[PDB]
């Protein structure tokens, strides 16, 4: 009988039957239905009658079982007395020669904090005063303590009965087996006795002595219990810069992340921390101790650095461990992050050296070039390293492989003015075999800026200019680029001037030069030719032309703040980006009142009628996410009764199977068809059910992408900013205004709120409230705001859309 709540009639029958097995099974079936929480008092006389005196342990044990989980509730066969049918003949049970029945009886009897059993539990310590097992003596210290807990904090429970009444706790210390139920409030002499016992311990018993009294002067003295306290005590005597090298903490710690890569990744972190405490700049974070595994002697054999190499990773162990490991290389050794990121990047970025680090997918290659290159932009020393490695990247000599390479290096030159003169000659080489945009773009920029340095350019450019591949974006990049630097410093059959001619043709003009350009018609609609066409005031010469622009870098460009940079090593970053970091007539009148922060729905129940409505009961219901914190409890609604009855309200619950409308309120009365009527007290909305939750800009952005929010409305009374009406109203449809999606200035400055919720509707809810408050001569519609809304199938989107207008209720009875 797993859980069957109607079966009590059969149990009575089964409980006495003249067959002992049946009786045991019955009583067992009662236990299992109560434990789940089901019907049990009908049976009581039957249950109690067979078992009572006997020394036959199994039925007695079963009855003994049922007296610690419901004795108080059941009363057919027990009623209320001092020597109840729980203990009257269980004084026999306590005083049987078999330890088990006595012991069991003692154990339940003393366990209860019952006051209708207080006297019978007190000399119940007799059953276990003699200690036939470790179990008997432990059973005794726990039972005396449980007696002490049960209203006997004074002389009824404190001395000895004949050996224990609160003194097993003392005795246990010096006896062969220990266990101290003495944790609080008990004899001082036993506490003292436990200390002595630390030495003459029994190990289970030591965990009991130890919860009470901890800290040792020793190293130990033995056993897991003492050992477990000991690592706590050690952390005290050296708190300083974490544990560093984990103590006896290490054993539990592995299981704490049994799923399976995460342990190594964690372990790797600690091992890296431990090596050294470095400068602790941007991603140079290694704490713990400065010297404890050093770094870098030149006589150390086979050195520290061997373990450091693991941390430099491509994936060399698996991805979770990889992400931890790349950060960890950066963390022990660099200048900041820059130094070790360049080494690390050199390995990752595409080459002709190894083909286990090159790939023909263009974005990844490109990104890897940008990561290597960002290190230079960060720190100078890296510029010198980067440029020759970049030329190796080029040497791959696939159209695309060159292409990616050329694209970053060209950015680097914008930063690094006439420093990378050397690269230009390498960069031209792979520009001729071509099937893509990227190669043309980049090459034309290097060869263009670099012209003073070289003289090749008609020849290199011209094979490509009459070759094909994909050429949209090529136009833009060649347009600003081709002439640049020194007015007449090249010549192969086209000097720098031919280049300016070319540069202009490629931009949007027409001219025979480099055997004509591939295309002329520019990239995306805004860019066009014209700016540059106007430009080249002084023909490709460092002055105030293309050259200027080329040998200068747009805004601030420093660090790895992503200003001509990309922020570490490209593969590690994907993982970091991913991390969102999300945090019968009846009359009612009613108002909601709050006194001393108690929120209640006031209801007055009125019988305007002369007719009888007796049988009157009042209930507030649990609909779904609405709940009663206590229904109105008066038996009112009688002939010409006016009553004030208070129903307490909650807003947060779990969905019930009954209707999901406004608030259900139920009054009952006389009638047999409609004994229960549902009638209303004032408004509560569907919106309550939504649950508020919040987003950060990353979670908002991810969800924006994840599912559409095209749906918009413009809501009146969003004249005001985010903070005022809009927040308060948004709150009531369990929403909250978080992070921005705005871009403010002297022409821009709609207030933008990123909203989130996680509705109990199988959807989230998100929105952006844009408040069109004029920051221009031509506003949208002046003050008002357009709320762009969604939910996960946009079923709550709509709630956001209208619950940001207005919202107010009041009455004054």
């Amino acid at each position: 009988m797993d859980s069957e709540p109607p079966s009590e009639i059969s149990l009575k029958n089964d409980l006495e039957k003249g067959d002992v097995k049946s009786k045991t099974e019955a009583l067992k079936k009662v236990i299992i239905m109560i434990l789940n929480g089901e019907k049990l008092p009908g049976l009581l006389m039957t249950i109690i009658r067979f078992v009572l005196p006997l020394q036959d342990h199994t039925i007695k044990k079963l009855l003994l079982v049922f007296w610690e989980i419901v004795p108080k509730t059941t009363p057919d066969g027990r009623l209320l007395h001092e020597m109840i049918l729980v203990c009257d003949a269980y004084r026999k049970d306590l005083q049987h020669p078999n330890e088990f029945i006595r012991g069991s009886t003692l154990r339940f009897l003393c366990k209860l904090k019952e006051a209708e059993l207080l006297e019978p539990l007190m000399p119940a310590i007799r059953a276990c005063l003699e200690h036939r097992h470790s179990y008997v003596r432990r059973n005794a210290v726990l039972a005396i303590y449980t007696i002490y807990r049960n209203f006997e904090h004074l002389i009824p429970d404190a001395p000895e009965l004949i050996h224990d009444f609160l003194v097993n706790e003392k005795d246990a210390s010096c006896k062969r087996n220990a266990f101290m139920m003495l944790i609080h409030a008990d004899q001082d002499r036993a506490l003292d006795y436990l200390s002595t016992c630390i030495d003459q311990v029994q190990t289970f018993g030591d965990i009991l002595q130890l919860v009470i009294v901890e800290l040792i002067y020793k190293v130990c003295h033995a056993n897991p219990s003492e050992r477990a306290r000991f690592i706590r005590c050690i952390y005290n005597l050296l708190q300083s810069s974490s544990p560093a090298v984990k103590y006896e903490a290490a054993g539990t710690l592995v299981t704490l992340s049994s799923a399976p890569t995460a342990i190594k990744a964690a372990a790797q972190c600690y091992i890296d921390l431990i090596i050294k405490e470095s400068d602790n700049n941007v991603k140079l974070i290694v704490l713990d101790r400065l010297v404890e595994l050093k770094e870098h002697p030149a006589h150390e054999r086979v050195l520290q650095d061997l373990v450091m190499d693991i941390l430099r990773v491509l994936s060399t162990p698996d991805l979770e461990v990889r992400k931890k490991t790349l950060q960890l290389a950066l963390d022990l050794v660099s200048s900041r992050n820059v130094e070790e990121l360049v080494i690390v990047l050199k390995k990752e970025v595409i080459k002709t050296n190894n083909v286990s680090e090159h790939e023909d997918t263009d974005k990844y290659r490109q990104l890897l070039v940008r990561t290597l290159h960002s290190c230079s932009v960060r720190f100078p020393d890296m510029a010198a390293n980067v440029i020759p490695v970049l030329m190796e990247f080029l040497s791959d000599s696939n159209e695309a492989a060159a292409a990616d390479v050329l694209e970053f290096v060209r950015e680097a030159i914008q930063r690094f003015d006439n420093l990378r003169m050397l690269i230009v000659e390498k960069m031209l080489e792979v520009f001729h075999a071509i099937k893509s945009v990227k190669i043309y773009r980049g090459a034309l920029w290097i060869l263009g800026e670099y012209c003073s340095t070289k003289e090749d350019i008609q020849s290199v450019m011209t094979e490509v200019r009459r070759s094909l591949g994909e050429i949209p974006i090529v136009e833009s990049e060649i347009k600003k680029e081709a002439g640049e630097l020194k007015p007449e410093e090249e010549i192969t059959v086209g000097p720098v001037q031919k280049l300016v001619t070319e540069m202009g043709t490629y931009a949007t003009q027409s001219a025979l030069s480099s055997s004509r350009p591939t295309k002329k018609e520019e990239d995306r609609p805004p860019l066009r030719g014209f700016l540059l066409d106007g430009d080249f005031f002084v023909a490709a010469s460092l002055a105030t032309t293309l050259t200027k622009i080329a040998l200068r870098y747009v805004a601030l460009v420093q660090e790895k703040k992503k200003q001509n940079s990309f922020v570490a090593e490209a593969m590690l970053l994907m993982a970091t980006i991913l991390h969102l970091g999300k945090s019968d007539p009846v009359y009612a009148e009613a108002y909601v009142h709050v006194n001393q922060y108690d929120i209640v729905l006031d209801v007055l129940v009125v019988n305007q009628t002369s007719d009888t409505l007796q049988n009157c009961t009042l209930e507030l219901a649990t609909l779904g996410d609405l709940k009663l914190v206590e229904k109105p409890s008066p038996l009112t609604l009688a002939p010409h009764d006016f009553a004030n009855i208070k129903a307490n309200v909650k807003v947060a619950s779990t969905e019930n199977g009954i209707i999901f409308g406004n608030i259900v309120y139920d009054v009952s009365g006389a009638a047999s068809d409609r004994n229960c009527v549902v009638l209303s007290d004032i408004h509560i909305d569907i919106m309550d059910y939504i649950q508020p939750a919040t987003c950060t800009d990353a979670e908002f952005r991810q969800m924006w992408a994840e599912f559409e929010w095209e749906n918009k409305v413009t809501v009146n009374t969003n004249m005001t900013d985010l903070n005022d009406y809009l927040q308060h109203i948004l709150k009531s449809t369990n929403m909250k205004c978080l992070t921005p999606e705005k871009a403010l200035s002297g022409y821009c400055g709609f207030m933008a709120a990123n909203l989130y919720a996680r509705s109990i509707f199988g959807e989230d809810a998100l929105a952006n409230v844009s408040i069109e408050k004029p920051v221009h001569q031509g506003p949208d519609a002046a003050v008002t705001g357009h709320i762009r809304i969604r939910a996960k199938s946009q079923g709550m989107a709509l709630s956001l859309g209208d619950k940001i207008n207005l919202s107010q209720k009041k009455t004054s009875l």
Binding site: Y591, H593, V594, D602, F642, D802, L813
Partner: protein
């Protein structure tokens, strides 16, 4: 036709409509019976009462029960509230096809396929009667709304009308003493197979499977095994009244009358359900719903919906109206037609209804419209949207078609539509499907007029002649011109004040009440759109927005007057009463009370003495009397209710006299209140009151600071000691400075162990001896001269004021 309900259950042999409630029972061939709340969508019960087909099903609503008959050969009675079998009885010896319940005593009738229908009395031991005649199966037994007679449809080619209180049927010749039944050729030929004959009816269509009545007619229609339906008079057994409806293709299981339409609805065991003309008695149209065969039919005796049972399940289907146009005059609701004929007026919480003569509608409603003075009703008839029909005007208090044909009142004339309009006796009509104006020449206008025409909009309903083709257009009195057009969001309704000059329109929050043309007088405060609400011409606006009728406002007061037990629409407010009718159109009325209204009419006119009487438990709530009256910043209302320890606290800061605060603060059992009121106290000016508070919040150090500022020296010392012990070094420390000598610090600091600080303080005052004591007890060296003096005079003259600022003067207003 609209599908209200459709649940696939599999082959439903029996179907019955509850006459009390809008419920359906179905008995299935699968042996399951189900009771459905078809409007609510909630399964009431489900019983497998027999293995095989259960062919008959009935409601036994005399006490809240359902009755079923199955092929167990029994009529069983079942509880729908307790789900138990109330009683079981032996109907017959074969299939119970249909069962019917007597309302005389708990007698049950069962019709069987063993050729008898019997009635059995449970209450006693008796089987009271057996009604015999059939020679082949009584397929169905059906109640009329009177309980005296029943009809049975049997497949021996007859319909037998029975008496249930009678032995079989009940009749006796007054022209002879002999039995009505003749077994010989008389004026008709039949056998001897009855006790007597009251009415043997034709059923010839090779046996009639079912018979049923229209709720208000003696006429019955029967569907039979062939492919015809035959309509019979059961009240005379005429054969000059019986017409045959032809359409079906195979054995017609049933045919019953549609209560609410002038059509007869039939269903057959082919695959079609066919609808029949009830003024022509032949098939108007055939529908296939492709659930295959239909073995049962049902027409609602509560005139709700209509239902037919099929071999896949059953459907209850809808041919009814939703949201009808209406207006209330003084005690008369006038509404546009809905099910259950004409009803209205009276009740206030019951879903019962009762009749009064106030029918605005008494013929197909092309238009129903009130006079703006409310003295006539215009009902436009003979449908059409061509250019002509008829319009009949009725008098508003009690309505006939014509009142007298010899009197100006109740006349009729032609006009496609006619609808009343302002000037309060006028009407405007369409009689060419243009806007024509109507006069009669004095009194409420009844006579057709052809002058004046327009070329915009198209005739329909209204109350000011509403016409639509893209908007709701109000038309003028004596001008062809459009008076104005309204475009707004609606909840499917148009709400009139009661006078039909004015109109209320529903908007995004609540409703707005407006005058003639579109001019907004005010907006009803309430978050959501109300279902309906009406204004007693202006001022007292009463509305429904849920299940309760509450006043938006009366004289600036706000109240919920009372709740009803059903959702409802306000019919309008004309008089003190507000009258309501819902979708089904059951009435509720409510007297506007002097409950909530008097209380706040009184509080507004600053009467508190009046207001105490006014306080009743029909309007007490929690915050409109006992805590709403704690909402004046110069307490007035606040003074009156102050019973809550919080309201008392509040009251005190709003005056600025915190003498009451401390006590409320006390009774709020809280420290925070004492410190905050103490601060307010310092603000009224007096520091005695501040001290007491601040002392018990334990801000001895704030006090220490306050105290020279206040100019006490005695009190300042008390603070020093009781802050000494706390080691508040910006409490105990203060006071020594503040008195002319520093000695207080010296000891406190000694106890802190701050010997240095203690010496410096002491030494400077020239208490070098104490300074030395501190040095000697602790580490010496007192010689050192810090960035502060270590021995330069400290003396201050403490507080020149003789009366202190604990004794700050006050008068208090």
């Amino acid at each position: 036709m609209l599908t209200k309900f459709e649940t696939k259950s599999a082959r439903v042999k029996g179907l019955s409509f509850h006459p009390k409630r809008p419920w359906i029972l179905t008995s299935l061939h699968n042996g399951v019976i189900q009771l459905w709340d078809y409007r609510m969508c909630t399964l009431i019960d489900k019983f497998d009462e027999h293995d095989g087909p259960v062919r008959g099903i009935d409601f036994h609503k005399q006490q809240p029960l359902f009755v079923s008959g199955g092929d167990d050969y029994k009529i069983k009675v079942w509880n729908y509230k307790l789900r138990r079998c109330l009683f079981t009885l032996l109907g017959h010896l074969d299939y119970i096809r249909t069962t019917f319940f007597h309302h005389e005593y708990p007698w049950i009738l069962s019709a069987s396929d063993d050729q008898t229908i019997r009635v059995w009395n449970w209450q006693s031991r008796t089987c009271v009667c057996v009604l015999t005649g059939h020679n082949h199966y009584v397929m169905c037994a059906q109640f009329h709304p009177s309980e005296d007679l029943v009809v049975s449809a049997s497949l021996d080619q007859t319909v037998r009308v029975w008496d249930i209180s009678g032995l079989r049927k009940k009749n006796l010749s007054p022209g002879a003493v002999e039995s009505d039944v003749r077994g010989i050729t008389g004026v008709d030929l039949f056998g001897t197979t009855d006790a007597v004959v009251k009415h043997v009816l034709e059923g010839h269509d090779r046996g009639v499977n079912w018979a049923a009545f229209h709720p208000t007619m003696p006429l019955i229609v029967s569907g039979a095994d062939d492919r015809q339906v035959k309509i019979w008079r059961m009240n005379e057994s005429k054969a000059w009244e019986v017409d045959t409806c032809r359409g079906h293709y195979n054995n017609v299981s049933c045919a019953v009358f549609h209560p609410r339409q002038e059509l007869i609805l039939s269903n057959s065991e082919d695959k079609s359900i066919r609808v029949w003309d009830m003024s022509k008695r032949t098939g108007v149209q055939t529908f296939r719903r492709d659930h295959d065969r239909f073995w049962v039919l049902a027409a609602h005796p509560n005139l709700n919906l209509f239902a037919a049972g099929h071999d896949g399940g059953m459907i209850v289907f809808k041919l009814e109206r939703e949201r009808p146009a209406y207006a209330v005059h003084g005690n008369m609701l006038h509404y546009v037609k809905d099910r259950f004929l004409r009803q209205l007026d009276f009740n206030s919480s019951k879903d019962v209804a009762v009749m009064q003569l106030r029918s605005g509608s008494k013929f197909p409603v092309f238009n129903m419209s009130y006079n703006p003075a409310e003295n006539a009703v215009l009902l436009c008839t003979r449908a059409s949207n061509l250019e002509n029909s008829t319009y009949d005007l009725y008098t508003i208090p009690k309505d006939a078609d014509s009142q007298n044909p010899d009197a100006p009142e109740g006349k009729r004339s032609s006009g496609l539509t006619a609808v009343w309009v302002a000037r309060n006796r006028f009407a405007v009509l369409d009689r060419m499907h243009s806007l024509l104006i109507k006069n009669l020449k004095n009194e409420i206008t009844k006579k057709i007029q052809v002058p004046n025409c327009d070329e915009i909009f198209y005739a329909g309903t209204g109350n000011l002649l509403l016409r639509d083709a893209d908007s709701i257009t109000l038309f003028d009195v004596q001008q062809k011109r459009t008076l104005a057009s309204v475009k707004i969001s609606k909840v499917k309704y148009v709400i009139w004040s009661a006078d039909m000059s004015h109109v209320a329109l529903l908007a995004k929050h609540a409703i707005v009440i407006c005058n003639r043309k579109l001019d907004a007088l005010c907006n009803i405060h309430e978050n959501i759109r109300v279902k309906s609400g009406a204004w007693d011409e202006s001022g007292v606006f009463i509305y429904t927005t849920s299940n309760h009728i509450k006043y938006a406002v009366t004289t600036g007061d706000h109240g919920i007057i009372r709740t009803l037990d059903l959702p409802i629409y306000v019919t309008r407010v004309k008089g003190n009463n507000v009258y309501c009718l819902d979708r089904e159109c059951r009435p509720r009325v409510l007297t506007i009370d002097p409950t909530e209204f008097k209380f706040k009419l009184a509080l507004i006119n600053r009467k508190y003495d009046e207001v105490l009487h006014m306080v009743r438990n029909a309007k007490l709530v929690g915050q409109s009397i006992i805590a709403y009256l704690q909402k004046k910043g110069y307490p007035e209302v606040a003074l009156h209710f102050v019973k809550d320890e919080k309201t008392r606290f509040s009251l005190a800061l709003e005056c600025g006299n915190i003498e009451i605060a401390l006590e409320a603060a006390k009774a709020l059992d809280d420290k925070n209140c004492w410190e905050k009121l103490g601060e307010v106290a310092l603000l009224q000016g007096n520091h005695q009151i501040v001290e007491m508070c601040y002392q018990r919040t334990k801000n001895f150090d704030k006090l220490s600071f306050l105290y020279l500022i206040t100019g006490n020296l005695e009190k300042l010392r008390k603070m020093m000691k009781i802050a000494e012990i706390r080691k508040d070094m910006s409490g105990h420390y203060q006071n020594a400075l503040y008195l002319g000598d520093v000695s207080e610090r010296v000891r406190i600091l000694k106890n802190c162990g701050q010997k240095s600080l203690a010496y410096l303080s002491a030494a400077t005052h020239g208490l070098d001896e104490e300074a030395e004591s501190l040095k000697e007890t602790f580490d010496p060296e007192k010689e050192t001269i810090p960035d502060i003096d270590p021995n330069a005079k400290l003396l201050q003259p403490p507080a020149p004021i003789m009366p202190l600022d604990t004794n700050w003067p006050l008068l208090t207003v």
